Amino acid sequence: FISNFVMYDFDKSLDDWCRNNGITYSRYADDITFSTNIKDILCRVPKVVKKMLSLHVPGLSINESKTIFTSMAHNRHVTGVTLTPQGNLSIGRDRKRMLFAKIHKYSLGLLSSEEINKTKGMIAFANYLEGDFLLRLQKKYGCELITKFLMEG
DNA sequence: GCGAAAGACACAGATTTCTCCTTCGCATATAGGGATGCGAAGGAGAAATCTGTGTCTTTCGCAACCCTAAACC
C-alpha cells in the first residue's frame, strides 16, 4: 500500500502525457506496459519515462535489459495471459492439452489423489479466465464423469 | 541492504640494462713523414619493466517464517 501511495504523482503525470498521443498505459507492481495501433510512435517513450522518473521520484531507475517490443506476428501476452490475434483472452494450447490429457488419464482411474487437488484449482482458474472451459469439457467427456470428478474428495 | 575474502583502478619510484659520449691509440694506403679514417675501453645517463600503497566491488544461507488449490508482484 505504501508503494502504491508513493507512485501517485508518477502515475498521474505519465497518464495525461500518454492519453494525448493515443497510447494505452498500465502499471502492475514494478512492471509498466504501453500499447497502441499507430506505427513508429513507441520509440520515443523511453526518454520520457526516464525524465519523469528523475523529476517526480528521485532514486529510481530503469533496468535497460528487460525492454520488449512486440506485434501481432509473434507471441503476445500481458502478465501471464495470452492474446490471440482475434482479440480474445486465452490460456495457451499447451495448457489446454495439459488438462485434456490429465482428465483422460483420470477417466481410467490412473491418477493419484494429490493430482486431483492439483488439477482442480487449475481448472477453476482456467474456467474463470475463459468462461467456457467447462462446457467444452462436458461436451467431450460427458456430465456424469465431470460431476463425479468435481465432487471427489 | 550488504559479512569475509581476492581483484581492478590510479599514482609513485626504483633499478638493471643499454646506448650515446670521450680519448688516445692505431693503421694503412700514400722513401720517411703526415693524414683521413676506424677500432678499444671507460663513463655516462637514458628507459622499459617491475613493484608497492590506498580506495572501491562484490553480495552472505544473513537469532526473531508457515504448513489448502491456481495465477501475479
Side-chain angles (χ1 to χ4, degrees), chain A residues 27-42:
Chain A
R27 179 176 67 86
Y28 191 101
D30 64 1
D31 165 331
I32 40 187
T33 325
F34 307 89
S35 91
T36 194
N37 268 320
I38 307 165
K39 212 189 288 283
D40 308 16
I41 198 43
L42 273 194

Side-chain angles (χ1 to χ4, degrees), chain A residues 3-23:
Chain A
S3 90
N4 271 343
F5 157 67
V6 169
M7 302 265 298
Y8 181 90
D9 261 292
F10 180 86
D11 290 328
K12 169 177 204 55
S13 286
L14 199 42
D15 205 320
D16 82 5
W17 190 94
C18 297
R19 155 152 45 74
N20 293 1
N21 295 60
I23 304 186

Side-chain angles (χ1 to χ4, degrees), chain A residues 65-93 95-104 106-112 116 118-125:
Chain A
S65 86
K66 307 194 108 62
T67 300
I68 290 295
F69 286 85
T70 170
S71 84
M72 260 169 152
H74 325 271
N75 193 322
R76 284 191 309 145
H77 57 68
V78 171
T79 68
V81 300
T82 317
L83 312 182
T84 183
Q86 313 322 311
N88 307 332
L89 314 185
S90 185
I91 199 193
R93 192 198 225 249
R95 309 214 221 201
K96 301 183 203 293
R97 296 160 81 80
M98 185 52 17
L99 308 182
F100 273 38
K102 291 277 187 176
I103 301 187
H104 163 245
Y106 163 75
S107 90
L108 303 193
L110 309 184
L111 255 194
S112 77
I116 315 295
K118 174 82 70 71
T119 320
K120 194 146 48 169
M122 181 65 118
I123 273 283
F125 176 61

